[PDB]
Design a protein around this ligand. Structure first.
Ligand code: APC
Ligand code: APC
Ligand code: EU3
Ligand code: EU3
Lengths: 195, 199
């Protein structure tokens, strides 16, 4: 539990289209959609042994390599799997909310995922009033920024991550001058399916 | 922690700082951890004393609720929230001072820490979100977006509130009123920067 510098893999995944689609539905329905979603995303993380740090609205933050130790390679492999697995759950969901009037009648829901790996102080943070497990540092910023920057329905990763990823699975490369970062960063959109 | 999602009138408060890793850049990891907590430790005390709820921590950001899970009059909601922000803004100056004199800031040119707070009141489906495997207490909806956006938009070391909130605030305590068009919102919104001090 106690905060410490460790090498971990952060995964952020947010959606775009929620608000507007539930725009119709009495909060009640809205809650039904969000939980459904969250229920899914969570499944993709736990099945791939990751840790669900937190939920920031419709955003999911997940860790790999903390609290439980995990090899930097297993970290990138499981962070990737979740991302692709999550992409499959939405399709499965968007398919159901479509056929149901919660979508299509309000564009279907879009997905944005960004993953990064690097050092980050990992521990319990907060105080007596409230204290949660989470990572903190420039590396967390990075992953997050990577996720806000990638195209809709895509997965973007840092070079640190891509080095574990087969070459032909990397769709597109590009340096991004991420806020607060001096050194522009090399980003990689990875194929959303595999090999 | 057993509350199923329900619409409700609550007051959301978001407060974020700036000068963390920059200041902490000046220390090794455990150094930031010792620092971040000192901060949060204070931020949270300002929420609890004013009887607010601490939804979550998003890094150096604090999300706090007023009017959930515990019922609270829309007026008490705005009074306890405003107070909290005012109390927060003072401890910051109190902290910065501590750090400056500690050489964590105002040295190796890491400017002292800045604060951003945005508050709004409105409807929001409050409750446990997620699913059996995982679910947390939080509010969801356009009203949450609003507060958050209000906080990202206000100047450094300032408190910005929506009209919905300002109507409970004495007129002379409102430094500025100005329409700012927020993302995803059709109707531009009337914002109010309130005096960081009472009266
Ligand atoms: N329950 C919650 N906890 C924390 N932050 C929340 C939240 N609900 C909303 N927010 C904040 O409100 C803002 C939500 O706006 P956006 O993330 O831009 C929605 P979007 O991704 O553009 O489309 P969407 O509304 O369909 O998801 C974010 O800045 C988020 O941090
Ligand atoms: N523990 C955590 N949980 C969730 N999100 C986190 C996080 N730590 C960092 N982040 C994310 O990383 C990003 C941090 O970027 P910023 O908030 O812009 C830093 P800043 O406000 O410019 O000043 P700073 O460098 O002192 O932090 C945010 O989008 C935040 O949500
Ligand atoms: Eu979103
Ligand atoms: Eu910040």
């Amino acid at each position: 539990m106690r905060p410490e510098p460790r090498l971990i893999t952060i995964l952020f995944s947010d959606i775009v289209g929620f608000t507007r689609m539930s725009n119709a539905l009495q909060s009640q329905g809205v809650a039904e959609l969000l939980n459904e979603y969250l229920g899914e995303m969570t499944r993709a993380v736990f099945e791939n042994q990751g840790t669900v740090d937190k939920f920031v609205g419709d955003a999911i933050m997940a860790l790999y390599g903390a609290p439980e130790e995990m090899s930097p390679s297993e970290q990138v492999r499981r962070a990737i799997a979740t991302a692709r697995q999550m992409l499959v759950a939405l399709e499965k969901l968007n398919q159901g909310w479509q056929e149901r009037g919660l979508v299509g009648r309000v564009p279907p829901v879009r997905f944005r995922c960004g993953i990064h790996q690097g050092m980050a102080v990992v521990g319990l943070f907060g105080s007596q009033e409230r204290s949660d497990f989470t990572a903190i540092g420039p590396s967390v910023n990075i992953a997050a920024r990577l996720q806000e920057a990638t195209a809709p329905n895509s997965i973007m990763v840092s070079a640190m991550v891509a080095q574990y990823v087969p070459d032909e699975e990397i769709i597109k490369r590009e340096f991004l001058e991420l806020k607060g970062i001096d050194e522009p960063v090399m980003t990689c959109v990875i194929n959303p399916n595999m090999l």
